[PDB]
């Protein structure tokens, strides 16, 4: 029904596929960052995850914040000492965009263990808005995921939770995930969750909707499957911990499949 906007879903999907290209960070921004690294960013994103858990924020807010950071980091050089200020302002903007009840600025100042002043956060906020020219309505892995889920026959909450978990994991690791668009990671995560839980694969339905095939998705799948297998050993643990919660049907506890058995369909 209307909650899944039958009259607009197709238009909405076409629009987000064009906006994801326009809101795409530069894949090689970290090399041009003199003083920060993939690992630093990984720590930051891992921290935002906990901030999100602490304030019981939406997953969408988290994804918006990472988008802002990466786009910001694409044009602006940042010292390691100020990476966290960038991320705090990001998360503040995300929250005000996306949340019914955003945390107060003061809350945001406090989660930085008084590393930064309130004046610093509000200034950074303004800086971030100028660098992004206020383009804050960026598409997320979520916006695609929730659409993809509509193709589940039948609906399955372990699939849904497992997909988000995988989609979140990818936020942590600029390498390789900057290479991939949201719509592609969502597709890979969706397939991988479906396969792990039900044994099934990317549906023709989503082939029609997206134009992506398992062949298209393979490079992102190979990567995302490896991240799942190595999730327990990653230096960053905040996402797995989060997804132990009943709220997300404890999916981080599900065992990843050993192989993907991804094959070629002959003359299809």
């Amino acid at each position: 029904g209307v909650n899944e906007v039958p009259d607009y879903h197709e238009d909405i999907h076409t629009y987000l596929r064009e906006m994801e290209v326009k809101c795409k960070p530069k894949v090689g921004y970290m090399k041009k960052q003199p003083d920060i690294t993939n690992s630093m960013r990984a720590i930051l994103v891992d921290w935002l995850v906990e901030v999100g858990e602490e304030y019981k924020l939406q997953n969408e807010t988290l994804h918006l914040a990472v988008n802002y950071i990466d786009r910001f980091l694409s044009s602006m050089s940042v010292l390691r000492g100020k990476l966290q200020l960038v991320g705090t302002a990001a998360m503040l903007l995300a929250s005000k965009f996306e949340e019914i009840y955003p945390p107060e600025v003061a809350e945001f100042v406090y989660i930085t263990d008084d590393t930064y002043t309130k004046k610093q956060v509000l200034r950074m906020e303004h800086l971030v808005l100028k660098v992004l020219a206020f383009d804050l309505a960026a598409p997320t892995i979520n916006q695609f995921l929730t659409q993809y889920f509509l193709h589940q026959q039948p609906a399955n909450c372990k699939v849904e939770s497992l997909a988000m978990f995988l989609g979140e994991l990818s936020l942590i690791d600029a390498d390789p995930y900057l290479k991939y668009l949201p719509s592609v990671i969502a597709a890979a995560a969706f397939h991988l969750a479906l396969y792990t839980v039900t044994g099934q694969s990317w549906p023709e339905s989503l082939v029609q909707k997206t134009g992506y095939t398992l062949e298209t998705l393979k490079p992102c799948l190979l990567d995302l499957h490896q991240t799942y297998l190595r999730a327990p050993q990653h230096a960053q643990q905040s996402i797995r911990e989060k997804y132990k919660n009943s709220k997300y049907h404890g999916v981080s506890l599900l065992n990843p499949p050993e192989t993907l058995n991804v094959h070629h369909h002959h003359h299809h």
Partner: protein, 297 residues
Amino acid sequence: PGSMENFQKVEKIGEGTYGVVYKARNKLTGEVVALKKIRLTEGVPSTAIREISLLKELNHPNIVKLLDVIHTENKLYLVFEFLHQDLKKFMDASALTGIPLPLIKSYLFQLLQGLAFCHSHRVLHRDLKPQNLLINTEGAIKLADFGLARAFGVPVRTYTHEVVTLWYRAPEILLGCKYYSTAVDIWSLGCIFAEMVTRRALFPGDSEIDQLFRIFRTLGTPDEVVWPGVTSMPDYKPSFPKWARQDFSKVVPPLDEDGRSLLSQMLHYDPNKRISAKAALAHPFFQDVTKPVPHLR
């Protein structure tokens, strides 16, 4: 892109979410604009965050153009295109004539275009009312005031409940429904459609319960047949009076069969059955539509 030096303040237009709106003139190009000023304690307000970021993407002839955003000292200025009047003021100027049917039809069709564009771009307006609809001297009408607007996902999540000026608020909101979608905007346009015809608000409630009882007294109290699930909505009460649906011809007596058909599909109780902006555009009501200029200055 711009600066405040090149703008000449003309006069106060109105008073919006950020305080006063001012008519001004760009001294270099001659363009007349409206300026919203936002004095920048909690940083940039979320309302402005949404208004600016959603309007940047919504370029359509029936949505007011955000021209620029100027960041001066401790202050933020929004530059919009200037529209002479709003619809409320024009309905009141039209008291003895009514709005001519050509104009009601032109304006409704334009509203539907503007809203379909919003919906196709995953935006809910969530405050459609005559005061937020701007008309120019050329016959355009445009959705304005996007401070209560929101970028939605598919399917929708629970968003803010304190949405839509009461007279224009859809029943699924009054009944505290967990989820609401694009049908809330269609409901608003329905109320406005009726309002253009009569020059008075269709459901002028004095409170949330009063609003719901006026709706019920006009369209009938909904039951499981008309609206499956209604009796289980959080703010449904079994003791609600059960009013009978009135001849819908009696809701807007001067409206003819096509207008009535369309209006009824805008004010359908069930948000699943309520007409979409996109589908409304093809309604037979608009078969002869044109876009004439307002009949009054």
